[PDB]
Design a binder for this molecule. Structure first.
Ligand SMILES: *C(=O)N1C[C@H](NOS(=O)(=O)O)CC[C@H]1C(=O)NC1CCNCC1
Length: 268
């Protein structure tokens, strides 16, 4: 049921000037669209969705975790910490840090939560526990964004991202209350309006998490999409490019998402 209908991904990535990786699954039928789906791409900020899921998994055994207040110093505030910079003098709860990491891609929040889990290896361990053998987080923010060609650090594949996203948002990897909280955080993301969401009709629910490394044309988005009247679709779109100064393209990500939905026969 993979690639029953061919779509012009090669032309798209040639127009972009790099590589595009796509994996999309119709959870009703199991039909899939797959293009470079098992290649590694840098995660960039997109690890923060899985980070929040790992926090929620821990909260299943720690009823007080989400409302625990976390104070932090000015040295925690790295580039692009738009929420946590406004609460430097007060602190925020674990749940607020999680929401900020997901919905505003807040870098200081992500590092604080990584510390709670035992660092990149602790998040990687959570991903292993749900059956993901591809994901690896190796470094903290901001070092994880280097996006070096051929470097497997801080990467996954579009397929493994989609499979893990499906387990966490629709499957049984989280308990039902935590699953719905993860979905609600993704639905409230503010950074993805020009990526997968731009390919999705406004009357369909979407949750997503973006990433943009800042070099090597490297940027991405993954999402769960609920078309009305049919089963949800899960998909991931990742990009990279050969030159350090190559720019990312939001339009290419939206275009790739459109081709994925077309390949699944989903009328938008
Ligand atoms: C994530 O990849 N981020 C965090 C933030 N939001 O972008 S998004 O695409 O996740 O929404 C800014 C870009 C990126 C990031 O952390 N970039 C680093 C800091 C800015 N200079 C380049 C590296």
């Amino acid at each position: 049921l993979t690639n029953l209908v061919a779509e012009p991904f090669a032309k798209l990535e040639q127009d972009f000037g790099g590589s595009i990786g796509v994996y999309a699954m119709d959870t009703g039928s199991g039909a899939t669209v797959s293009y470079r789906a098992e290649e590694r791409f840098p995660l960039c900020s997109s690890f923060k969705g899985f980070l929040a899921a790992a926090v929620l998994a821990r909260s299943q055994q720690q009823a007080g975790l989400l409302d625990t207040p976390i104070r932090y110093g000015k040295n925690a505030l790295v580039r692009w910490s738009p929420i946590s910079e406004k609460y430097l003098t007060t602190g925020m709860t674990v749940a607020e840090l999680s929401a900020a990491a997901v919905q505003y891609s807040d870098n200081a929040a992500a590092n604080l939560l990584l510390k709670e889990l035992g660092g990149p290896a602790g998040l990687t361990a959570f991903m292993r526990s749900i059956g993901d053998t591809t994901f690896r987080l190796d470094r903290w923010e901001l070092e994880l964004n280097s996006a070096i060609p051929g470097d497997a650090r801080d990467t996954s594949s579009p397929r493994a991202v989609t499979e893990s996203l499906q387990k966490l948002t629709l499957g049984s990897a989280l308990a039902a209350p935590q699953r719905q909280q993860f979905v609600d955080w993704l639905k409230g993301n503010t950074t993805g309006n020009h990526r997968i969401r731009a390919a999705v009709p406004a009357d369909w629910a979407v949750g997503d998490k973006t990433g943009t490394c800042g070099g090597y044309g490297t940027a991405n988005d993954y999402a769960v999409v609920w078309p009305t009247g049919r089963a949800p679709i899960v998909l991931a779109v990742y990009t990279r490019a050969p030159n350090k100064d190559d720019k990312h393209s939001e339009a290419v990500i939206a275009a790739a998402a459109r081709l994925a939905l077309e390949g699944l026969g989903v009328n938008g």
